[PDB]
Amino acid sequence: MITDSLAVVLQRRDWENPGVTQLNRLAAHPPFASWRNSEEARTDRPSQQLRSLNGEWRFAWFPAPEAVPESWLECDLPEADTVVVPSNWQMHGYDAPIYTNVTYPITVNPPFVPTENPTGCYSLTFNVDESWLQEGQTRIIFDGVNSAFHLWCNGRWVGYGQDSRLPSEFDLSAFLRAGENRLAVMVLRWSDGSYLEDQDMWRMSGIFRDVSLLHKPTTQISDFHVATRFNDDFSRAVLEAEVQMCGELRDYLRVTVSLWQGETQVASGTAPFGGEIIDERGGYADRVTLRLNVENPKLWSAEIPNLYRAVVELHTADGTLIEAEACDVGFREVRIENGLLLLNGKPLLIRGVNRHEHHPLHGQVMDEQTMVQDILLMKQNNFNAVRCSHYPNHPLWYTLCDRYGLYVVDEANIETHGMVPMNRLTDDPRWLPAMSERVTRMVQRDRNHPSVIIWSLGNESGHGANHDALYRWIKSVDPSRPVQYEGGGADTTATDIICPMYARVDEDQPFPAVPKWSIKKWLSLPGETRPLILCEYAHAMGNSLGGFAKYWQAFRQYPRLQGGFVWDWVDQSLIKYDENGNPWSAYGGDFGDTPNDRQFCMNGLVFADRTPHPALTEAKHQQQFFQFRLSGQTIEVTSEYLFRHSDNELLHWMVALDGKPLASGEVPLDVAPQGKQLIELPELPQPESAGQLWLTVRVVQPNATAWSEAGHISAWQQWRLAENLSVTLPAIPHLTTSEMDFCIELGNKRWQFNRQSGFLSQMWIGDKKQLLTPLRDQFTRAPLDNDIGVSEATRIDPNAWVERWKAAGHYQAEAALLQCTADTLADAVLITTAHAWQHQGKTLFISRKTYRIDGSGQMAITVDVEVASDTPHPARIGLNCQLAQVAERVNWLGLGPQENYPDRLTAACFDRWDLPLSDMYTPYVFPSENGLRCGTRELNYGPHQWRGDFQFNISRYSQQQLMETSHRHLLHAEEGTWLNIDGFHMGIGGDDSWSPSVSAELQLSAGRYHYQLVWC
Amino acid sequence: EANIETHGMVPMNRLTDDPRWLPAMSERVTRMVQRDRNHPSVIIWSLGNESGHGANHDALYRWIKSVDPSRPVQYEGGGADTTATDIICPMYARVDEDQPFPAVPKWSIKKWLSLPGETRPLILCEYAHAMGNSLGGFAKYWQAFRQYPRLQGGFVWDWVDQSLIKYDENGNPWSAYGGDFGDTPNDRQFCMNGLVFADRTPHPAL
Amino acid sequence: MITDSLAVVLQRRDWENPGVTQLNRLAAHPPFASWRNSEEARTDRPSQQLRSLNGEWRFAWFPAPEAVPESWLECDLPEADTVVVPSNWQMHGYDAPIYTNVTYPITVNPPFVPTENPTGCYSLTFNVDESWLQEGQTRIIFDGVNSAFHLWCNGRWVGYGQDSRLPSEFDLSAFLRAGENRLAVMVLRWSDGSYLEDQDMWRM
Ligand SMILES: OC(O)[C@H]1NC[C@H](O)[C@@H]1O
Ligand SMILES: OC(O)[C@H]1NC[C@H](O)[C@@H]1O
Ligand SMILES: [Mg+2]
Ligand SMILES: [Mg+2]
Ligand SMILES: [Mg+2]
Ligand SMILES: [Mg+2]
Ligand code: NA
Ligand code: NA
Ligand code: NA
Ligand code: NA
């Protein structure tokens, strides 16, 4: 009882030693439930031998493990609270969460951690029946503890564990007692395992996954491997099951393995224990391999996730069942052949996304309802694969990916991004034991899951010799799955797939040791033969995903470009509450954590409550499984489905004339995997009116599926048809000139131009003013996250667009009135102006305008702008003003319902759209320029109408307030409505968010620009 | 050669195919390479001896090839031609006669070179077992080594007898083997396989 | 001084655990002598910074590590003999050497070894100058110990090692003192490292 004490157990300091990653922990294995009935195992009913210890626990926080009193090992602390488990303790306010990207949250001095190490003392009092203690084995299973822990059971020390993302199991058979038992668990926030856990995410701690008790017989199944081999046409498979047993070998022991396709038993095999001769000493007495033949098996894929049920029975020769286990089996073959990743003989096209386990309320505690909501949203947006960035997930995630159909990259919990250099640990043999436990225990847990098709060695840890060793371990133990790893340049000997992060389509990025070549160039470098799948691309931080269509054009054209995984799925924001209890989304330094990396945790396609960002519909369009070509009257549909026929798809088509519908119809799709269907439209309506005819098609699923509602739209496309230019041609407004203003009147309408500023300063409809701010040129935007270009908060890039714009005085440029005149035409008043924008005597821009007010009360505005070639190209070229009116609806003829930019508008459609005014603002958590719609020919708001060919955004927030506000909950609506009408608007970039990423064709570099707008 | 031999296990790779023994095994390989990599006389690394073929062998082979590409790695276990070795290095493969065991056949050295796919050199890690009055047929190996270019020799078993000195009742020393110290069970005179006696006096086979 | 005791150090039983092959052992490296003169290094003369501790040591044999009394950590046992180091203790008649080819000399039950585990308690009293302690680092280097051992320096526990054929080195800078120092080394015949050491040879 001296050796069970805290002074003894703590003094060796196992959390500051990479050579001790566990003590008395059991071997890793696939998920067990220990069914004592074969029918409960087959139907996956809940075993009575697996007890969840989740629920109310006692919890006490301590600033260091030395501060834990010795009485906690025997009795509950009076100062302890009662908390729910699983949970992170930072979500209950005991200390703060820390957001840091690359820089470690502790002092870099491995293997040591600080003396101030926050310690969470968990305890649970609970009952075990005597029947669990009279026979068999009782183990406790912690599915995830962050980041290291010692365990006591009834005041006796049991063991120690360190990987936060894999289960730790301990035998409690010698420690339990009939009646009352008490577990005490001491969780440390930091350890030497923390040096391998430097992912770009919130750093939390605690018992954040499930805790369970499992009872097994003394003679028990200890492991089982399922594999499926095929012939060349996939018409016959062999399910090879390898079972291992612990306990005492008797000759009456048998293992039966049955395969079930639903209720039909499809194959079965029985055998005594005894593997085949392995070497000179013989073979495994405690193992048996059962080979089950399967004729014409239904194949598993993400398109059709066909699953079987394998039941493994350990029984006696007289048919007495000892123990049953089971798993869902998916028949599929993953293989790289001739430079191509093949699934069931067909080359994949990976429509993937990276997904952290994140909940804005529960932190890193994952529940089945959140996982199911994520999977449906992903599949509804045409994703077919997920990368577990950057750790083994909750075990239910793989079961859900098996059932719904998503390919999965399973990734070991190793990231050492903060080291200098990045491979300082991974090239060191003294850390090879630690790293090997994080790879080998992941493969042992997850190797039976069909949805897992690729292993990953971790993320952003350079390239060391330990990576090459662990790659060869996985290839030896599990040849059925390729291994990939990005570190050290993404094409090392530790990966089977070239898997770069943020390699661009056409532009090379020649860094010194780790160049990011263009994806197209990288395939043809001499010697290179591997497929290329980006492990991260299209960094979706805020208003992003510009240039996303360029990737998908390249993926379809190049056979060895097999897709990639978008960064990333969900924003990593946390909910805080204001003084009146209103929740608001928080990021980086919002919890007092310093240093931190601010809004860089929020890179998602969806908000933290799983509401979609506008970029997600661009991804759904570019990733869609039907492609269309129009010839004249004939549509050519091509399926990108590799395995399924289009048996739940109906093609709707419509023709409209400037929003006005003219004809439409439906045709059922009937296209094979990778085939084509020709669809002949009827003789189209030839309208007499002027305007552009548009053809829109949409593929609709009439029947619901497991992941989609009835009527789900899965793909669409729009084309221009014939165009009829208008050759139809359409009292006298009075010009009253004073010294300060030009005032024009026409009936109840009046326009006033200020002669000192040169801008339209006011309009009247009757006695009602319409403008609160004048109508003035605008050359700037409230900067996006891609404009700001910061991944680490300590590093500012002078080549970023916001630094160049600020240093060039774009945000402070003052206009000088060069000319302002007025004249009376035969039927109109013409106002001519010219302004020059200057910063310290440098003329940035010149703007020449003419305002032409006719007799019908229309104001035709013509704008010609000159941009200095040595200033950085402006973010926009347009006009802005604050209208006095606040209206409920915005109606307009242009591209798409959602926010779209010139770099990201392929998913939007030309049509007449009508939305509430709050729908015209995208509430990004870090505020910025948002809500733009491009390609617009007409805009209606209140009594006003604008016509031309422009991009607009309209909101209650000025660009100045957007730039000056760090959080969206601090925004307040201004007095009127801010309108930004842009002749031209820069792209938004998004190849990455820490360097300039707008392509040169999306920049405003033409030097001279022209646009025209008609108000009324 | 790393200090790894698990000959007594059943099967021989029960530990070396187990990931829970991969840390132990890795320390025995990596600390040998770190100590000895500057020595010019060391031209080949070995992963140990008579431990079957496990996944840990393939991992530690790839570690050595990454850290020190200047030396080939060999390993005999699991049939002497696995993916854990750069050299076909069998023990007691005969010149012309095959020995077809089940999982680990000892082909004839000449036949082993021409099996389909095989391209590696062949150097016997043990051959010509010199137990007592032995080394019959030694000239047959050396005729084969000179004739076949990919037969690049081998290592005789072995140099010195492993006998220990005991003393009689009058203090006369005598050479002892196996169960001469009360150790039981033991394997008798099988420790004495040398070309020389334990006092380094040569046997006639030398 | 409770945690330096035999009852504390032994009770975790590091020799029956393949996940603990060392504790507080330094990184492996090529052979060092730390010459403070470039000409002595080039001509391979013997460095004054490398001291051989070979010679006469005190030795006591025990049938198991539990049988070691607690007073051995602080003072020499009166029953101890004086033996030369390096040496195998079976060549001094303390127990017998074992010749076995393939069959392990212990019960095959990894990672466990028998409770009857023959233990060799070595100790050495020796002097260090103050100049070694005033600055720099002092390490002890065991070039080979069969098959596993715990180490104490002046009654404080220093570490643990397991590979019998490679050097184990430990930093002794916090443990040494000017004048008289005493190392105590407890060598175990069998451990979980013995499962990887089944060569056809005498087991000593
Ligand atoms: O590998 C990923 O975790 C990192 N790459 C960029 C992304 O923002 C994240 O920090
Ligand atoms: O590998 C060697 O150690 C073994 N092969 C045969 C020889 O007698 C010895 O037992
Ligand atoms: Mg540790
Ligand atoms: Mg990182
Ligand atoms: Mg050990
Ligand atoms: Mg042997
Ligand atoms: Na492709
Ligand atoms: Na990030
Ligand atoms: Na030759
Ligand atoms: Na022998």
Number of other CB atoms surrounding residue C167 within 10 Å: 18
In what order do the strands lie in the sheet containing C81-85? C22-23, C156-161, C148-153, C179-188, C119-128, C55-62, C81-85
User: B78 contacts in A (CB within 8 Å)?
Assistant: 279
**The token pair that represents C75 in the structure block:** 């003072």
* Separation CA A126–CA A818 (nearest Å): 84
SS3 B62: helix
* Half-sphere CA count of A551, side-chain side, radius 13 A: 33
User: B190 contacts in C (CB within 8 Å)?
Assistant: 99, 101, 200
Which long-range contacts (C-beta less than 8 Å, at least 24 apart) are formed by A729-735?
Answer: A730/A856, A731/A855, A732/A827, A732/A855, A733/A828, A733/A829, A733/A853, A733/A854, A733/A855, A734/A829, A735/A822, A735/A823, A735/A824, A735/A829
Phi, psi torsion values for A580, nearest 5 degrees:
-95, 15
Our separate counts of H helices and E strands in chain C read 3, 11
**The token pair that represents A374 in the structure block:** 């994520």
Angstroms from A470 CA to nearest CA on chain B: 6
* Separation CA A898–CA A935 (nearest Å): 13
Residue A602: nearest ligand to its CA?
A: 8
What contacts A2, CB < 8 A, 6 or more positions away? A8, C2, C7, C8
The experimental method is: cryo-EM
Residue type, position A312, single letter? V
The gap from C-alpha B101 to its chain's centroid, in whole angstroms, comes to 18
The gap from C-alpha A437 to its chain's centroid, in whole angstroms, comes to 28
* Separation CA A863–CA A286 (nearest Å): 85
- For ligand 2, mutation pick of B5, B157, B158 (most atoms within 8 Å of CB): B157
User: C163 contacts in B (CB within 8 Å)?
Assistant: 3, 27-28, 31
Task: Tell me the CA–centroid distance for residue A16 and ligand 3, in Å.
Answer: 5
Residue type, position A305, single letter? P
Angstroms from A274 CA to nearest CA on chain B: 12
* Separation CA B93–CA B108 (nearest Å): 6
Residues A330 and A406 sit within 8 Å (Cβ to Cβ): no
Which stretch of DSSP H or E encloses residue C7?
helix C6-11
E strands, B37-172, where?
Answer: 45-46, 73-74, 122-127, 151-156, 164-167
Q: After which residues is chain A broken (C to N over 2.5 A)?
A: 730
Closest CA to B127 of B92, B80, B76: B92
Note the resolution in Å, 1 decimal: 1.9
Residues A948 and A937 sit within 8 Å (Cβ to Cβ): yes
* Separation CA A469–CA B19 (nearest Å): 13
The distance in angstroms from the start CA to the end CA of chain B is 25
Residue A532: nearest ligand to its CA?
A: 7
What contacts A676, CB < 8 A, 6 or more positions away? A636, A637, A638, A639
Q: Which residues line ligand 2 (CB under 6 A)?
A: B 49-50, 91, 126, 157, 193; C 101, 199-200
DSSP assigned state of A219: S
CB contact under 8 A, A3 and C20: no
* Separation CA A140–CA A54 (nearest Å): 12
Question: What are the beta bridge partners of residue A305?
Answer: A300
CB contact under 8 A, A7 and C7: no
**The token pair that represents A825 in the structure block:** 């035409």
* Separation CA A108–CA A111 (nearest Å): 9
CB contact under 8 A, A436 and B19: yes
Residue type, position A283, single letter? G
* Separation CA A918–CA A892 (nearest Å): 15
- DSSP characters for A417-446? TTSSSTTTTTT-GGGHHHHHHHHHHHHHHH
SS3 A264: strand
User: A433 contacts in C (CB within 8 Å)?
Assistant: 19
How does A263-284 read in b/e, with b if 16+ C-beta sit within 10 Å?
eeebbebeeebbbeebbbbbeb
Nearest residue, CB atoms, A19 vs list C7, C22, C28: C22
How would you write A708-756 as a 3-class SS string? Answer: CCCCEEEEEEEEEEEEECCCCCCCCCEEEECCCEEEEEECCEEEEEECC
Phi, psi torsion values for B138, nearest 5 degrees:
-65, -35
Task: Tell me the CA–centroid distance for residue B150 and ligand 9, in Å.
Answer: 5
CB contact under 8 A, A21 and C23: no
Question: What are the beta bridge partners of residue A127?
Answer: A180
Closest CA to A1003 of A990, A986, A1016: A986
Question: Beta strands A201-203 and A211-216: pairing type?
Answer: unpaired
What contacts C13, CB < 8 A, 6 or more positions away? none
* Separation CA C37–CA C46 (nearest Å): 11
**The token pair that represents A786 in the structure block:** 């891609």
C-alpha pair distances (Å), A204 with each of A93, A105, A419, A997, B48: 11, 11, 20, 32, 44
**The token pair that represents A719 in the structure block:** 């084309």
What contacts A803, CB < 8 A, 6 or more positions away? A789, A796, A797
Chain B (30-59) residues lying within 8 Å, Cβ to Cβ, of chain C? 30-32, 34-38, 48-50
Nearest residue, CB atoms, B63 vs list A433, A469, A477: A469
Residue type, position A616, single letter? L
What contacts C73, CB < 8 A, 6 or more positions away? C4, C5, C6, C152, C155, C184
Q: Is B90 exposed, middle or buried (0-12, 13-18, 19+ CB in 10 A)?
A: buried
Which long-range contacts (C-beta less than 8 Å, at least 24 apart) are formed by B179-184?
Answer: B179/C99, B181/C90, B181/C96, B181/C97, B181/C98, B182/C96, B183/C96, B183/C97, B183/C98, B183/C99, B183/C100, B183/C105
Which stretch of DSSP H or E encloses residue B141?
helix B138-147
Phi, psi torsion values for A224, nearest 5 degrees:
-155, 135
DSSP assigned state of A346: E
* Separation CA A107–CA A858 (nearest Å): 67
Could you identify the atom of ligand 2 that is nearest to the CA of residue B131? 8
Q: Which of B50, B97, B118, B169 is catalytic?
A: B50
C-alpha pair distances (Å), A505 with each of A353, A519, A534, A561, C95: 18, 5, 11, 10, 73
Nearest residue, CB atoms, B22 vs list A283, A436, A471: A436
Nearest residue, CB atoms, B20 vs list C18, C90, C97: C18
Residues C186 and C68 sit within 8 Å (Cβ to Cβ): yes
Q: Which residues line ligand 1 (CB under 6 A)?
A: A 101, 199-200, 389, 459-460, 501, 536, 567, 603
Cis peptide, bond prior to residue C147, ω within 30 of zero = yes
Could you identify the atom of ligand 1 that is nearest to the CA of residue A199? 3
* Separation CA B156–CA B176 (nearest Å): 23
DSSP assigned state of A763: E
Phi, psi torsion values for A890, nearest 5 degrees:
-120, 125
What's the residue count for chain A? 1016
Closest CA to A954 of A925, A982, A988, A935: A982
* Separation CA A81–CA A74 (nearest Å): 17
CB contact under 8 A, B31 and A429: yes
Which stretch of DSSP H or E encloses residue A120?
strand A119-128
Q: Return the residue matching tokens 């000017």.
A: C178
Task: Tell me the CA–centroid distance for residue A924 and ligand 1, in Å.
Answer: 19
* Half-sphere CA count of A903, side-chain side, radius 13 A: 26
Phi, psi torsion values for A248, nearest 5 degrees:
-105, 130
**The token pair that represents A380 in the structure block:** 């509804």
